């Protein structure tokens, strides 16, 4: 039976509303008075980060800060502005100010806790993951927190899922994974629930076992899988 529910963090938990304008403001802070359109810088940054994230999926862990600093070094060299030595801190300030959970998250996590193992699985480094959970006040809502840094590899490499299952003491067939962007979990027998809040991730629909738009649907799926629907 299903004894554990794992959440893809931060994707299933943290709102992305307004993030494009937040990232535009980061680029404005990088540039200052430099005569480059911040939207042009943002678009080029997003191209390079897309490339990097595609490259690193399934590969050994590398720190995000190192990756993003490399991207910014390349862009500063390309466009002629001074490399922002504090780019990471500029970005972190933005994420601290505007981090915000989706409105149903806390009650869903509390509804599952104690009845099922409630786990978090993330590609974030461990320090970043813990700081995220603490900033949003939900660290104690998880029974396990499993990172790419601990496993050694980024999703969708199976090691991170194997480690999460071992921490919980459950088999894959006893677990659900709620995912935001599953390029993985099913290699280990886990049941996959894709969270698609806007009904826009059709490239992931067909491999998912279930698709939901709101995490309150997760409870109802787990109940059904356990014969209590
Ligand atoms: C990217 C960005 O500005 C952000 C990310 C997470 C939380 C808040 C803001």
UniProtKB/TrEMBL annotation:
<dbReference type="InterPro" id="IPR011950">
    <property type="entry name" value="HAD-SF_hydro_IA_CTE7"/>
</dbReference>
<feature type="binding site">
    <location>
        <position position="180"/>
    </location>
    <ligand>
        <name>Mg(2+)</name>
    </ligand>
</feature>
<dbReference type="GO" id="GO:0016787">
    <property type="term" value="F:hydrolase activity"/>
</dbReference>
<dbReference type="InterPro" id="IPR023198">
    <property type="entry name" value="PGP-like_dom2"/>
</dbReference>
<dbReference type="GO" id="GO:0046872">
    <property type="term" value="F:metal ion binding"/>
</dbReference>
<dbReference type="InterPro" id="IPR051540">
    <property type="entry name" value="S-2-haloacid_dehalogenase"/>
</dbReference>
<keyword id="KW-0378">Hydrolase</keyword>
<feature type="binding site">
    <location>
        <position position="180"/>
    </location>
    <ligand>
        <name>Ca(2+)</name>
    </ligand>
</feature>
<comment type="similarity">
    <text>Belongs to the HAD-like hydrolase superfamily.</text>
</comment>
<keyword id="KW-0479">Metal-binding</keyword>
<protein>
    <submittedName>
        <fullName>Uncharacterized protein</fullName>
    </submittedName>
</protein>
<dbReference type="InterPro" id="IPR036412">
    <property type="entry name" value="HAD-like_sf"/>
</dbReference>
<feature type="binding site">
    <location>
        <position position="8"/>
    </location>
    <ligand>
        <name>Ca(2+)</name>
    </ligand>
</feature>
<keyword id="KW-0106">Calcium</keyword>
<feature type="binding site">
    <location>
        <position position="8"/>
    </location>
    <ligand>
        <name>Mg(2+)</name>
    </ligand>
</feature>
<dbReference type="InterPro" id="IPR006439">
    <property type="entry name" value="HAD-SF_hydro_IA"/>
</dbReference>
<dbReference type="Pfam" id="PF00702">
    <property type="entry name" value="Hydrolase"/>
</dbReference>
<dbReference type="InterPro" id="IPR023214">
    <property type="entry name" value="HAD_sf"/>
</dbReference>
<feature type="modified residue" description="Pros-methylhistidine">
    <location>
        <position position="23"/>
    </location>
</feature>
């Amino acid at each position: 039976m299903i004894r554990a529910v794992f959440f893809d963090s931060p994707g299933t938990l943290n709102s992305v509303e307004g993030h494009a304008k937040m990232h535009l403001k980061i680029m404005e802070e990088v540039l200052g008075d430099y005569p480059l359109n911040p939207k042009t810088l943002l678009d080029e940054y997003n191209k390079l980060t897309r490339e990097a994230f595609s490259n690193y999926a399934g590969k050994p862990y590398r720190g995000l800060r190192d990756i993003l600093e490399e991207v910014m070094r390349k862009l500063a060299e390309k466009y002629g502005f001074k490399y922002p030595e504090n780019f990471w801190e500029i970005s972190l300030r933005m994420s601290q100010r505007y981090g915000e959970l989706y409105p149903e998250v806390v009650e869903v996590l509390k509804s599952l806790k104690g009845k099922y193992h409630v786990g978090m699985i993330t590609d974030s480094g461990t320090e970043q993951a813990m700081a995220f959970l603490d900033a949003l006040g939900i660290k104690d809502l998880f029974d396990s927190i499993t990172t790419s840094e601990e496993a050694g590899f980024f999703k969708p490499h199976p090691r991170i899922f194997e480690l999460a299952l071992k921490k919980a003491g459950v088999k894959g067939e006893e677990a659900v994974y709620v995912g935001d962007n599953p390029v993985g979990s099913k290699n280990l027998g886990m049941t996959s629930i894709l969270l698609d809040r806007k009904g826009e991730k059709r490239e992931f629909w067909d491999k998912a076992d279930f698709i939901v738009s709101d995490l309150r649907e997760v409870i109802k799926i787990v109940d059904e899988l356990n014969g209590q629907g």
